[model samples]
Target: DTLKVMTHNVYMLSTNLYPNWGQTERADLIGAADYIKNQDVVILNEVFDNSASDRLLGNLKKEYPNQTAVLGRSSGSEWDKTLGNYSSSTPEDGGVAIVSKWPIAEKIQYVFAKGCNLSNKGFVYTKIKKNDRFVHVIGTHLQAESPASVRTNQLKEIQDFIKNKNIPNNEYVLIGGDMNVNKINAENNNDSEYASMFKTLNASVPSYTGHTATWDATTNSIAKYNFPDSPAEYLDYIIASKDHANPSYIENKVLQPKSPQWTVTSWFQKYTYNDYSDHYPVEATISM
Candidate 1:
């Protein structure tokens, strides 16, 4: 059987003073739901706000029936450990979730021990029963805006967790999320963090050639506004264990909804409609 997968950071962090691009979280998430409903599996990051979580999950549940609950909580996280039990961090969900067309036979969530107050980042593991076979899917969002060490340690944590689980090599193990690691450098070579991602998980990004930046400011207007002076980066990914049939990036017409084009006065741009998210979703297909 073949599987279609996508990983996207929905960018629903509207709790900021400016309400995150001054766009309506509900509308964007609903749009996102409509956009990604057809994929065999989807892993979302940054479904942070409670209302935002409901909007996306509720809208997509009909199509993607097997959906994980919004994963992590802010209270009593590793961030609060340093503050003597005071939950001073932002009030939000872990923002990572998995929605699948197949039945989820088993599932678990893990909160990263190394992170800051902005959000509690983590990954959710789902053992999905696809038809007569089973595949392991991990949806995660690593640390953002912090030093690379933080994300590195978080990767190690995932590495250790998967190692301890000891999933058999025959079952396809596909990991997808907004890793926040620039896979390619300015010189267009593989970055160090990118190497660590595959090394840590003993996985490979299926037939990844390069130049596809999920968070490209040049092409994505929302990303352009978010990072005015920043260069495009490939931060999101869908990686699989080396033992599986190599997957290739596929073009699915229904992968994204043609957004309604709403105006944003926050940054003053020519375009009217809000894109799916600040970051474009990464998509691929694999048959085992």
Candidate 2:
């Protein structure tokens, strides 16, 4: 049995960082949904806008009948003053969502005990049934630009949750999302944060083992516009449980919307944005 899965950070920020970027973002998300609906399972990150999120889901619902609700703060809710202390802004949603072609047998959500900002970041445990088999999916997004220890604990939380669930070893399990760990830096520098990610989850990046950075500043206009000084980093992943057969990674949209450009006004100048997202989407094929 074969299954195809993908992870993408569709970069729809709730707060408009730039003047006219929202217009481009709204249209790009719809295009992303149209492209992503073909995949068997897709874990999307940064879907923080309400109406935009609705539009993206609407486009995908035909191909992906089974889906999980957006996990972050809603548009109308007042921000928790306590959480507001952590960041200057609160995201419109939790920044994570999942859609699938198969039936979702069960679903559970866990909000992180501590998030760096108003991220409201968390992970979702979704049991998807394909034929007669079940694949336990832990779709998540971890803290960004925070201390290494925080991500370690978040990974531990996911690990502990999996252990506690007592999922059968024979059942398929996948942890896919924007992990926010720089893969190239971690492996090259022998960073503990990267090591902890694998050891904590007992998972391996079975798909596409290349130094190609998912968050490339040079290639992605959005990343360049947002983080001008940041180095290219491989942050997104679709890691597989260690015990399962190693997956064959497929190179999905390395740089999405290769041709389209959005003429949006920026703080510095008016420009045409090329990429749909700041981070590129990745894909993989696994045996069921």
Candidate 3:
């Protein structure tokens, strides 16, 4: 069987202090639904509340009704109040949800950013039974502003969890999400601290190609940057177990807006620097 997985940061459902642009909300939802309709499993980051999660999932269930979600809380009282009025009571500060079309035998959450007062971001593990084989799915959204040392430590925890927990090698393991690592510079390259985390996990950087400007400025139509033509970066990813020998087993593709005219403005009317969330979504397909 083929399992399609996606990692997206939905920008907190385009919630901001200012009035939004026309059709922006519907556009964002449509983009998300488009992804869900095409893929089987999705690992999402920065999902603010139960409402956004429900809306996205509701749209997907219209086609793949067997989907399930594993939710993680990544909010704290202080950060929640400081970042925005919204708050999350779960262990991880922001909200992270893993939606899948397959049966989920178990869900495990890990907290890695406790010291920085950042949401304790970690991994969400799901055991998926595909045909006669069982595969492990792990998703994570690492700290964007975290120091190199902090990211390294967080990755260490992830490595230990998988290695010491006795997860089987044959069972496919996929770790994906917004890792916050910029691939444009040497400091942010795969050899950097954050990328090393994936190496330690026995995974490889399968692909690197995405948009330069995914965030919008205060105004909905005005992009924070030039966008498609602008210098690009790869901050999101999907890392699979090295044991999966066939390079053909992985399908890595960057999901672009339907057209170049589909800018951040497509989602809202009024625009502000903080209106929409930063970070675009990335997706991959795996053979189970």
Candidate 4:
């Protein structure tokens, strides 16, 4: 279906939530460009401002000029009847973005009914054209820091919405990004939600061809440590529709950063694990 589609929660440097905000921002500008140049299509989550969003898009456009998404959050919907261009750095407002070498059309955004208390959550989907075929590519960030129950509800919301879309001519949908699989608060919630959530997407039989643990770079053993988080978790995904979008997926794994890719990255610089982001970028290479 496609060469390679990637999903990453870039973990904003402008948000100030990360202790190394200033440092991370510097590395991420080019780091985003690096990732963008390599993948055919890319989905980025957690862009926190006009500066962060603008900078990432600027770098992305440096190599790819034809992309179909505005960088903003907290104020957009499925029936807005106009494009949303949000560049606010107010902290309470910030969200996801999609960039592609292939052209995209028919854009739609749906704010999750349920969201983390920290930030607003939503989905951004578009009709993407590749050669002579087209498929819906959906980029989303679900409820983070919430219980798995709430997160599952958010998934169902998008599932039902996308299910209704029923892309034309069998050109199905591709959904991915920050499912928050096995979140910190889920405790023993394990893969229960992912199972039912996968079933939900199959109403139209969309493919769940992605990774198991995209957020696995950190170790949970540190729960009682100075850093109470683990690396072997899968919070991100790169799902495709069954046969239409991705008849088969060849290469699927975390796109780990090269050593040089971590030079100014904050997570790796302070934490013990690899460091492009709190979670590694997850990608799927699909074939028609």
Using lDDT as the measure, the top candidate is: 2
Per-residue lDDT for 144-188 in model 3, tens only? 665666666666677777776587766777878777665545435
Task: Name the regions of candidate 4 deviating beyond 4 angstroms.
Answer: 13-19, 23-35, 68-91, 116-118, 183-191, 203-212, 217-231, 242-246, 259-274
Candidate 3: RMSD to truth: 6.8
Give the local distance difference test score of model 2: 0.70
Model 1 TM-score is 0.81
> Per-residue CA lDDT of candidate 1, range 40-110, in tens?
88888888766756677777877888887766654333221221122335465578888898998877777
Better of 2 and 4 by lDDT: 2
Cα-based TM-score, every candidate:
0.81, 0.83, 0.71, 0.75
In order, the Cα lDDT scores of the candidates are 0.69, 0.70, 0.56, 0.59
State how far residue 102 of model 3 sits from its true place (Å). Answer: 1.3
lDDT, candidate 3, at 24: 47
Off by over 4 Å in 1: 16-35, 74-90, 186-191, 209-211, 243-258, 264-271
CA RMSD, predictions in order: 5.0, 4.8, 6.8, 5.4
> How many residue pairs clash in model 3?
19
Better of 1 and 4 by lDDT: 1
Give the alpha carbon lDDT tens digit for every residue of 1-288 in model 2.
Answer: 778787878777654653366634553445454446567888878877666666776667878878877765442222111221222255445867788999988767666776554666878778888878888787888888756678887887888778877888787788988887766756745455766688888987464544388888877888897888888987777777776444444232333545355676657677886666788887756765
lDDT accuracy of residue 62 in candidate 1: 78
Clash number for each model: 3, 2, 19, 14
What is the C-alpha lDDT profile of model 4 across 1-288, one tens digit per residue? Answer: 346778777666554454544334533544554654667677878765546666666677755555544434534443233223332343444367777777765666665555533444667777777777776778888766647777778777776776676666466577888877553344345356655555555522223333445565343212213335444665677665553444544455666553233322454555332354556677666666
